[PDB]
Design a protein around this ligand. Structure first.
Ligand SMILES: CC(=O)N[C@H]1[C@@H](OP(=O)(O)OP(=O)(O)OC[C@H]2O[C@@H](n3ccc(=O)[nH]c3=O)[C@H](O)[C@@H]2O)O[C@H](CO)[C@@H](O)[C@@H]1O
Lengths: 697, 20
């Protein structure tokens, strides 16, 4: 009977929409039992199987649906989603284009094709496809919300206010009707949503992991109640898909090795394969135990492995980012599970116990926005490996081409040795700063930059054009290795004016909103000789910023764009700027540390979300409270003062330059020790028989 | 190349088919 089968299929679609996935699977299967050649049932069953993490089984049923019905467009589009999840981009593309070929009016297929363009970095094409999807189906939350993020990326602010209004109403309606919100947890920081909505969004995405582990039917793990199996050592497991060339490793790659081997046993669990970088090599070498979980794709077997190691504290460094396997944490293989560093927000999930943060980043008055208990580090929870990765930026010298501290800059490990070979250096009491006079050697260096030469040799010392690092040493340019030569960095290299204040921001452009640019234009207008230094991140966002700046009163020549550079050049060229203007909507985090290590003062205005407060926490630990604004006026006034009071600028720049070293901000050893105290606080609380509570010291 | 950043995969939309 078709009717018996049709009713079972339709009822299963209902169960699926209600979030009852188990019952949906059951009813689809009973439909196929009645009517085995049921194309819709095969495709629908494959959708919920995909949602349960059973990807290969899903593919089988999609193909069966297509055999039965060769022009079943829904099956092609749904199959593509599975292939995309399996990282088979080409396969996904071919399914989407096929479905669209079968039915050009298929809105879902256009929206799914758009997501591929988006994830490939082809934003204009993603935008066009999302608009085609919305044109065919105006009520389409996934298409609208992802379009909104596309427009955010390229700083398209057309009808921005109506866009926010729509986004919030979409989330509201979706939460009320118990749907998976079309706004991603990470993206929710960018929109004017309540804290309640943001945590709810995170909670729903956490639920997706529960769907994938319920099918495993694993029992609760037993957990260690002492440190006797581990000889009194606390067993800590760090779980990350980012052990390699990723901002995460650029922050904490030294931490596993800094740990006290007398009290701690470090297990690193990698969710990604080896990329061959020195970043991956270091962690593998310095951790007590390194486990490649990308060899164990079954979350059941993987979580089994973690549990066999006897982990006391398991650390989530991914959150809701690519490469995450949060199913591992949902299975609770460890008695204590904490979020750390990788994800700037709450998991919203019950399977997480703590978020490691600090008082400045996550004050008690806003603890409501987190589902975890707060675990305070004594200063900032943030850390960087800059002291290890870029020690060549610890000292610097300049050339008097006329005394500026950021017009023509030299750095190098062997810089002091080179300066000793020069009989006419002046030491300007600012640490102090060596100045090379405009002599034969200075002329040769400036000639190299002007003629675009790669590298010259002076007194046996290699002097490198800062723009040519990849041509000289790839590993040095990526930060895998410390540069060996003396590098030259000039404002002429990036078309920056010699006689003007340079305000910079090296974040991705999505972090900028119309409110922020307004605030920047106010500052530029009050500092006559000043430019704004931004990155083509991505480049297609450039004409948008330029146009909106015109509408705010800024001529185009006031804004200077540079391309994104290799890691080392990016950190180093921050020395050329006078002041960094931080983005209030979402701060620089890694790039915040990048700027401060260059000795550049950063002006910030902390908001309510975690992501909007990280810069203020960094500056607090750094010891520069005068760079922290309490509102937009104060933000503007601080920035305008630094740009106009040049003695105050000299004082503040000098302060930051000294404090990179003397403050605990880049001190990975002091960090690791403090992090160990927090771990022990966590463990004793549990070992004494307590459920997690705020470890706010 | 372009810098590796903190990245997130864009969600897709499954289509449920009703039998009529
Ligand atoms: C909003 C956001 O996503 N925040 C996260 C982000 O930091 P943040 O927001 O600071 O940075 P991004 O994810 O944009 O990553 C940008 C990366 O590009 C590099 N760069 C920048 C410009 C350039 O010209 N050259 C270059 O190589 C930066 O050094 C950084 O490593 O990743 C960190 C590591 O997971 C997390 O702790 C932060 O929570």
């Amino acid at each position: 009977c078709p009717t018996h089968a049709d009713s079972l299929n339709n009822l299963a679609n209902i169960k699926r929409e209600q979030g009852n996935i188990e019952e949906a699977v059951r009813l689809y299967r009973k439909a196929l039992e009645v009517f085995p050649e049921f194309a819709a049932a095969h495709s629908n069953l494959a959708s919920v199987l995909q949602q349960q993490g059973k990807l290969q089984e899903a593919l089988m049923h999609y193909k069966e649906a297509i055999r039965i019905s060769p022009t079943f467009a829904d099956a092609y589009s749904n199959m593509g989603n599975t292939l995309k999840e399996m990282q088979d981009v080409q396969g996904a593309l071919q399914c989407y284009t096929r479905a669209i070929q079968i039915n050009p009016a298929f809105a879902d297929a256009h929206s799914n094709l758009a997501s591929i363009h988006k994830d490939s970095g082809n934003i204009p094409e993603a935008i066009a496809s999302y608009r085609t999807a919305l044109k065919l189906k105006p009520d389409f939350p996934d298409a609208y919300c992802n379009l909104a993020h596309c427009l955010q990326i390229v700083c398209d602010w057309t009808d921005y206010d109506e866009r926010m209004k729509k986004l919030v109403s979409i989330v509201a309606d979706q939460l009320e009707k118990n749907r998976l919100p079309s706004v991603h947890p990470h993206h929710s920081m960018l929109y004017p949503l309540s804290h309640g909505f943001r945590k709810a969004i995170a909670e729903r995405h956490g639920n997706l992991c529960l769907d994938k582990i319920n099918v495993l039917h694993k029992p609760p793990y037993e957990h260690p109640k002492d440190l006797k199996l581990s000889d009194g050592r606390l067993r800590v497991g760090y779980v990350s898909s980012d052990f390699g060339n990723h901002p995460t490793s650029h922050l904490m790659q030294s931490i596993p090795g800094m740990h006290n081997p007398d009290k701690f046993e470090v297990f690193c669990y990698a969710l990604s394969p080896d990329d061959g970088t020195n970043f991956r090599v270091k962690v593998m070498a310095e951790a007590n135990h390194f486990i490649d979980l990308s060899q164990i794709p079954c979350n059941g077997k993987a979580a089994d492995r973690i549990h066999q190691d006897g982990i006391h504290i398991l650390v989530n460094m991914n959150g809701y980012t690519k490469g995450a396997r949060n199913e591992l944490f949902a299975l609770r293989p460890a008695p204590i599970q904490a979020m750390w560093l990788g994800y700037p927000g709450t998991s919203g999930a019950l399977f997480m116990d703590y978020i490691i943060t600090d008082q400045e980043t996550s004050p008690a008055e806003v603890a409501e926005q987190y589902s975890e208990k707060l675990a305070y580090m004594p200063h900032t929870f943030f850390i960087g490996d800059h002291a290890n990765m870029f020690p060549h930026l610890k000292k610097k010298a300049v050339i008097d081409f006329k005394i500026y501290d950021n017009r023509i800059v030299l750095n190098g490990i062997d810089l002091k040795a080179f300066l000793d070979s020069l009989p006419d250096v002046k030491i300007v009491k600012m640490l102090n700063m060596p100045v090379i006079p405009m002599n034969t050697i200075a002329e040769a260096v400036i000639e190299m930059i002007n003629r675009g030469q790669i590298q010259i040799t002076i007194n046996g010392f290699s002097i490198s054009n800062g723009l040519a690092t990849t041509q000289i040493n790839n590993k040095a340019a990526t930060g895998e290795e410390v540069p060996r030569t003396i590098i030259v960095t000039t404002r002429s290299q990036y078309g920056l004016p010699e006689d003007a204040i340079v305000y910079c921001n090296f974040n991705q452009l999505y972090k900028i909103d119309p409110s922020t640019l307004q605030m920047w234009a106010n500052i530029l207008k009050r500092v006559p000789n000043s430019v704004l230094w931004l990155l083509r991140f991505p480049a297609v966002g450039e004409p948008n910023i330029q146009q909106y700046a015109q509408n705010m009163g800024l001529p185009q020549n006031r804004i200077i764009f540079s391309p994104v550079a290799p890691k080392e050049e990016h950190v180093r060229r921050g020395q050329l700027a006078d002041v960094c203007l931080d983005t209030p909507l979402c701060n620089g985090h890694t790039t915040g540390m990048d700027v401060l290590w260059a000795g550049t003062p950063m002006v910030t205005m902390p908001g309510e979300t975690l992501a909007s407060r990280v810069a203020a926490s960094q500056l607090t630990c750094l010891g520069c409270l005068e760079l922290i604004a309490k509102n937009r006026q104060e933000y503007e006034d601080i920035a305008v003062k630094l740009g106009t009071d040049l003695e105050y600028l000299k004082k503040v720049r000098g302060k930051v330059w000294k404090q990179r070293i003397s403050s605990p901000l880049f001190n990975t050893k002091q960090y690791t020790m403090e992090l160990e105290r927090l771990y022990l606080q966590m463990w004793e609380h549990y070992a004494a028989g307590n459920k997690p509570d705020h470890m706010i010291k | 190349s372009n810098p590796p950043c903190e990245t997130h995969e864009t969600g897709t939309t499954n289509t449920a088919t009703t039998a009529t």
